Amino acid sequence: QPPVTNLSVSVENLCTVIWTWNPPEGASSNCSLWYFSHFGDKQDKKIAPETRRSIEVPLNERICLQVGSQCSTNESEKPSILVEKCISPPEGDPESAVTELQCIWHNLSYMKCSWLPGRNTSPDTNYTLYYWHRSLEKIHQCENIFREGQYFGCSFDLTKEQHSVQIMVKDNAGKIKPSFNIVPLTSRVKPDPPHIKNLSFHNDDLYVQWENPQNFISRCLFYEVEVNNSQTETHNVFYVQEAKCENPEFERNVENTSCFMVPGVLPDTLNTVRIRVKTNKLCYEDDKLWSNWSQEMSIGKKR
């Protein structure tokens, strides 16, 4: 019932914001104290007996946590007194924040990040990207920087309950506003291009058999098959949910291969085939990133 004591804040790693408090001085000895905590506008409510709460949030906005004490875990039980402690983003020049900061995990091997300079940016500023995940001993500074045009970037290695990777872009001079980015280990994944093993015909049906990347299994991937014809000037495209090997007559016996059949295709003309691969919502969090197209494989009568 009374207010909690010593509701303070701290920042571990890069984006780990931790609220910690102490039990109320006014106390009922006949009470199992549960703490009702929520953020702005009744967001992310949680009732827990712990005197601490930590979340992973990009510190780009001032967010506050309200803390109330309870004796019951019921919904009807609403604390009369709540203490709120807020935390603001680090100091820096108004429009110095780097824009369009994105990070893509390439084939579960390396993370490549890119961003654009802020509107209010000094010409002599030097960008520095820092990353961190649970497995690391401390905050690491990505040194493999790159510059693709007007874009600034940095790519670091990253090999494979819910844990994510924190990314901070900040100048060591401490003149510009540090920008943050949280990347879940199950999202922003761009696989490698697959490898076509064989193309086989059955009347007017074309069986395409390829191989997925080594770090990805069959059921975790959404497929796209491209079939370009020379004579008919056709640029067909097929989207496949899942592709399994059905007819062994027109397929190799490699057990890591997926198979798709394209109907209404003639050997009379030359047919070029490419395969593109992305992750589905069944195994990963995002299905927006396609891999690069596979190498071309042709079949049929040449011109």
Add this chain to the structure above:
Amino acid sequence: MKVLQEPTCVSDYMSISTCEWKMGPTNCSTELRLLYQLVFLLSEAHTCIPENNGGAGCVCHLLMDDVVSADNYTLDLWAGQQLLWKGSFKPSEHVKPRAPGNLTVHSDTLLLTWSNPYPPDNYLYNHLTYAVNIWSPADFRIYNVTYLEPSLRIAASSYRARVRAWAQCYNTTWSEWSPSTKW
């Protein structure tokens, strides 16, 4: 008076589940009532008035709101006032997808375009395998469609086409054949 064949129910995984059985000759619409309810808690029974197949044969149409794989339905075939047959039914185990439609032929290349009979909300909206039969009778060539877009493009090398669907993962039976299109 006595149930000869036990009710064989099939579902289209959306709102409807067709049950069918065989009885001597009787009036199922008058005497027989099919009571069905979901095993899910807060049980609410439902009464079905079965239509007649013909010659000691009746067919009942069960109505649902949504269908998930875990759904299990207990069946109670009430003969007048006395229970004739008791059993259960699982829609996901015996799925029969509803037939596709709106098939239109063609024209640079011969093209066929039909429609997905399921709404985007449904689960089969992305898990339906099609099969187009194009004949003139043994001149037919069957095509298998396992990609998303319900399109079929072939070359020209007096015909009639038809389309049916099949859900791969649920190991269903083939859907009924769509109304053919002559050209």
Add this chain to the structure above:
Amino acid sequence: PGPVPPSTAVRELIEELINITQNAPLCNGSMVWSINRTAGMYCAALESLINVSGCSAIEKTQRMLSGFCPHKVSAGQFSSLHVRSSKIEVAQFVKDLLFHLRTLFREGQFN
């Protein structure tokens, strides 16, 4: 977690949880017990979500978890069979459940 789930049943539940998180607060900020271990979460998730009364959006999800749990589940069973760690919003509950299923789908425990 529980009995070996069919591939279709997992893919369906996963797809449903994703469909829910696409919008307005889920179940108007109703709160349920969170899950600690994946040793028996298939019944723990159901025993937790069953305490939600007036939410229609979670109804399809609740009906799916019934096939993943061997025994029968009624309202108010979580406290006795599982450790009460913390209560969270249904939205957070679904996201955590979705993550556990997606992890299970990669490991391929189904069937």
